[PDB]
Amino acid sequence: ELYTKYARVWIPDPEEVWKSAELLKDYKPDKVLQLRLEKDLEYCLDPKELPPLRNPDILVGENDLTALSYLHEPAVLHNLKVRFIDSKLIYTYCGIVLVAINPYEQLPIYGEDIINAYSGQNMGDMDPHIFAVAEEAYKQMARDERNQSIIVSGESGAGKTVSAKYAMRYFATVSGSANVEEKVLASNPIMESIGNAKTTRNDN
């Protein structure tokens, strides 16, 4: 079966939601797994679940989470954690969706040379970036007069405003110019004043 000796599985852990373990003795149908941890453990296999298997490392870190063969919570969390911590990439496709992780830091990627590099390129060509969504919307609008939307969702403080800001900066740069983006960014203080509130979990 897939669960052989020197297989790897994700096991639940209190302090990080899942942790890796290597299957130290191959499994047969029943109640036991001998597991080894970066030490030595036995884990009850219980109703029933086998522990989530782990993707082969060639798949880990790829630009699209649906490129993973096993799709499950710890494999997704691992691919986002490695891309963010090791690569310091903050953008990752999931299917159609673009996932964007708040770095709480400035980054060089929003330079106008990169704006030009993205312009005219389809989503397959380049690593994910918010400009790669803006450019898709722009060319969908060009092909067919149908209006286009960009929809940004997440808990407040996840950076939705800065994502919109760079999204419209893309349009301003690619179309050329009419000082819209300045006025739109200048409107945010009043809309935040009248429209935002402290909440138990979150300010603004």
Partner: protein
Amino acid sequence: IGVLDIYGFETFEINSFEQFCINYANEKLQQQFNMHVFKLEQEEYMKEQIPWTLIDFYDNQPCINLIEAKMG
């Protein structure tokens, strides 16, 4: 081209009419998402000439009818 900044799904130790409205709006947006993705998959399956039947729709309409139908 239009850009929509909206809150996501919300859960606290105490949940109340505000969280109920926010979670119902998010159920609506998530339905419209799932149905757009399903449309695009049916298009890609046409593009590869694969039978459509293989893909099944996952429908949160019963929870919307739970919240907003008459006698909801």
